[PDB]
Amino acid sequence: NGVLVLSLLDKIIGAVDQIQLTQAQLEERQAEMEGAVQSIQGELSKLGKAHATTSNTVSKLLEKVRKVSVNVKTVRGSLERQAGQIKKLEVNE
Amino acid sequence: GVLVLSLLDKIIGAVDQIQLTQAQLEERQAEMEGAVQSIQGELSKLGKAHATTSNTVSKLLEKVRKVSVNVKTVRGSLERQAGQIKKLEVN
Amino acid sequence: IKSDQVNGVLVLSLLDKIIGAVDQIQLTQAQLEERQAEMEGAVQSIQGELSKLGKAHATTSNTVSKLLEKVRKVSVNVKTVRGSLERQAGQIKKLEVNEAE
């Protein structure tokens, strides 16, 4: 039976051997992902500043476009006020 | 003699718990790995999407300027035309 | 190996190293779980921050597609205004040389 005890001992040894190997692999895999995740937060943190900036720009842009359309109306309003003036004079000769 | 076997059983019990715990460790280690790879996916997606939008916005900036300038050349042309007309009004 | 005293020594030293290894594995396994828990919580918060940001960008990309459409509603407006400008210029010069006395 002493043979059965040793027979059972190196089986237990084998198990723990593998469990140690696999758990190494887990420690590694996990370290790796904590790394991935920390990259991602950094980059997500950056893209957020980026967008806030783009956002801020578009608002400027929206205001410039508003100014422009007002000028087109002035210039047009100014324009056929002249057309009226040009009509007045091609009427008197 | 008999003490060694109780030990062995104690150890074996310990070891089997470890084998279950480690298998569920791997399994959600596997899950979060895939969650993380998804997150990199939609992020890097979003990052490109944003570059675009920003390239578009810069192109808009310059379109607006060009227009803005034209509207002013047109205002200035109309100022030259009004001067012209006013002397026609002398006769 | 035939003797008892010696095999006893074998078993003893093996048994003892098995138990040290197992007690380390448990300590490590204790850690692995706590870290896996830390990260489900990080990952979800990341997910939360991220999808929030995509919603942010949608709003913007849409504002831009709007602004893009209003601008060459303004360029249409502008080159009809330029269009009538020299039509006016021609008819003015035609008054100026119609004049030409």
UniProtKB/Swiss-Prot annotation, chain A:
Biological role stated in the UniProt entry:
Plays an important role in caveolae formation and organization. Essential for the formation of caveolae in all tissues. Core component of the CAVIN complex which is essential for recruitment of the complex to the caveolae in presence of calveolin-1 (CAV1). Essential for normal oligomerization of CAV1. Promotes ribosomal transcriptional activity in response to metabolic challenges in the adipocytes and plays an important role in the formation of the ribosomal transcriptional loop.
Q: Which family is this sequence assigned to?
A: Belongs to the CAVIN family.
| UniProt-listed GO biological process terms | positive regulation of cell motility; protein secretion; rRNA transcription; termination of RNA polymerase I transcription; transcription initiation at RNA polymerase I promoter
State the domain notes: The leucine-zipper domain 1 is essential for its localization in the caveolae.
- According to its UniProt entry, this protein's organism is Mus musculus
Q: Name positions with the PTM Phosphoserine.
A: 69
Q: Which GO terms describe its molecular function?
A: identical protein binding; rRNA primary transcript binding
- What's noted about post-translational modification? Phosphorylated. Present in active and inactive forms. Changes in phosphorylation pattern may alter activity. Monoubiquitinated.
A GO CC term attached to the entry: caveola
- The molecule here is called Caveolae-associated protein 1
Provide the organism lineage as a comma list: Eukaryota, Metazoa, Chordata, Craniata, Vertebrata
Localization of this protein? Membrane, Caveola; Cell membrane; Microsome; Endoplasmic reticulum
* Quaternary data: Component of the CAVIN complex composed of CAVIN1, CAVIN2, CAVIN3 and CAVIN4. Homotrimer. Interacts with LIPE in the adipocyte cytoplasm. Interacts with RNA polymerase I subunit POLR1A/RPA1. Interacts with TTF1. Binds the 3' end of pre-rRNA. Interacts with transcription factor ZNF148. Interacts with CAV1, CAVIN2 and CAVIN3. Interacts with CAVIN4.
